[PDB]
Amino acid sequence: ESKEEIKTMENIDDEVLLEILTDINWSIEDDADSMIERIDLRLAETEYLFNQNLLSLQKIGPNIRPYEDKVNDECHRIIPTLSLFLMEMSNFSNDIENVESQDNGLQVESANKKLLWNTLDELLKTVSLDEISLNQLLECPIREKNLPWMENQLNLLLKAFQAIGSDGNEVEYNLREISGLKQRLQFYEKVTKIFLNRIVEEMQKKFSNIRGQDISHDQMIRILTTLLIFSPLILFCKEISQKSYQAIVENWNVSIQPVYMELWTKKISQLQGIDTNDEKMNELSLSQLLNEWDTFRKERKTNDINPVFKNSFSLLTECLQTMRQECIVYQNFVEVFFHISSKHNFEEYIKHFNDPDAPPILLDTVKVMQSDREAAVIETQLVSRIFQPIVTRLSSYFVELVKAEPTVAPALTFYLENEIKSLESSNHEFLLSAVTRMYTQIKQVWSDNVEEQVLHFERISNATTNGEILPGILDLPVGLKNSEDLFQFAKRSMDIKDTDEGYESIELMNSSFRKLSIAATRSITDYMETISLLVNSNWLTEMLSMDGIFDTSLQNVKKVFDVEKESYASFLLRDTMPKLTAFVYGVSNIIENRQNLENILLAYTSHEIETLVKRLHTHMVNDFGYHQENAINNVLCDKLWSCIQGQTVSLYLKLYTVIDKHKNDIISAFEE
């Protein structure tokens, strides 16, 4: 109602999008502006941290640089000896010139090559003024064969710039007093017509480059067409006399970046295809640890279906199309002006040498460029909801972090945006799943313990079953988050450093924070949850923790110490002594690959809990008779009397349990 200003490209939109891409501009927030203040103080301590990091410490690191650099001042200190040697030979020899030629001295009597000729020695200014070969040797041009507009009319426009059009006369000399009135005004009028000719050849030939979309993408017609533009930017007057030739290379390519930028924008964002639910592959990394090891593995390394390049394809494609936004935009370092340098009279050297690579190629410069925004934000924002990565994509996103060291392009800042695809790619690094492990070990304890409130007994009458899920089949994703960290993550590499590993400490929080998440499994430490606890830990610690790459070993023997301590508590009314402790207490987990009768799902032979409590209370507690039984067997006395032939001294030892709680002759000597 109070219609506000014309928002035409203010101090924002120079990545103020990417500035506001800290978390979200999703409603809205001034709270998020405070969050920006927090990230600003984070950068303030990281940059004061860089400051005193580099202020004496890496200013001595700069003195460690002054080994090489003061060494350059040491060969350059021989250049002080070469400079005082040449300056001493020419100092004393030029003093000998001061006494030699100036014997009279009197330069109008002893050295009068220039005192006879105070202006007549500077008498080589006869090329004035205009304008024969400015438009005759270049119609628009006459060029493209190292021809008279390349070889001659260019250099005639260098004569239009050799003519210093504002240094006209100095009337005691008076070389171009009135000749400078229209020398480069007709040479820059006719070359203003050649300038508008190359401007219409820039919008025209660059609209043909907008038609040039050769092969994914590739603007190869803009490369051979860029060979038809190196002479326009070489063109040494100089070439942009009033920032115009570069405006034919940049302001003409302003909209003609957005033909290539719109091209990649609609182009790269169309490769979308995914799966739905992969509990089968977690039954292949649960079937891996079943037949392993203890067997031949299983896994292969098996799937890990993410190792098939659903998103790792772009790691060589949208890092290569990002390397069209960067490295073929570093072939727009063959089209910036080009590479304006170098021809020098005025198209002489680039009349011969007009063939750049340009990409990438080294690093010693200072420059700036554009045309990489939406390919970067497309590659990262495309890769966003990726919750399986970057666990298996550790060396992928860290190779992306360590991609571009040695170029002079902004592909390092892309690799830093691809470090942001490892680091500003947020806590995935997924230790909020530990917050899901304690928070879902408390707010989901109303379902698993709802069958297991009494778990290892039957006082509140519940079966010892809770489950290890999260991280049960996520322990299968330790072999699937670790198996594809050696093939898929290794096939995502690049220049310095980039895998070269070297990297993937993620992947060491698959030791560190996986033993922290597995310490929440130690906070999750029921006997199908002790059985599922050590079966899940050892379902990762059969192959993934010895290759010995984990840190949950003491978590596995800690929850397995709770499997000994709670499987002989679930069988604390059964074994007693070893009569249920070998095939019926630990083998309710070993053969599984209310707690009195509730070990009867696998119930490995012999003397299971369905007979250690019944066929020991059926004329077996004293003996088949009474002290002692005539049976040491392996069929039913193993529940009855071979148990008594395996717990013989445990009769009097078990009767000693009443001898501390509430002498020993008539029971411990003559027990019959």
């Binding site: 109602e1 506000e4 014309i6 203010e10 501009n25």
Partner: protein, 49 residues
């Protein structure tokens, strides 16, 4: 939040997108290329629909 609240007052849509149609004409007296402000009046449009 004003939208589902009352009517939105209607002024909390009417006057709110009037005095916001001020700055939605910040997003309309020129736009190039404020995809920020374009996203702003974009969600204003979708909410109004």
């Amino acid at each position: 939040k004003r939208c589902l609240t009352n009517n939105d007052f209607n002024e909390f849509i009417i006057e709110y997108s009037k005095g916001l149609t001020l700055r939605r004409r910040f997003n309309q007296s020129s736009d190039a290329s404020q995809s920020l402000v374009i996203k702003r009046i974009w969600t204003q449009i979708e909410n109004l629909l």
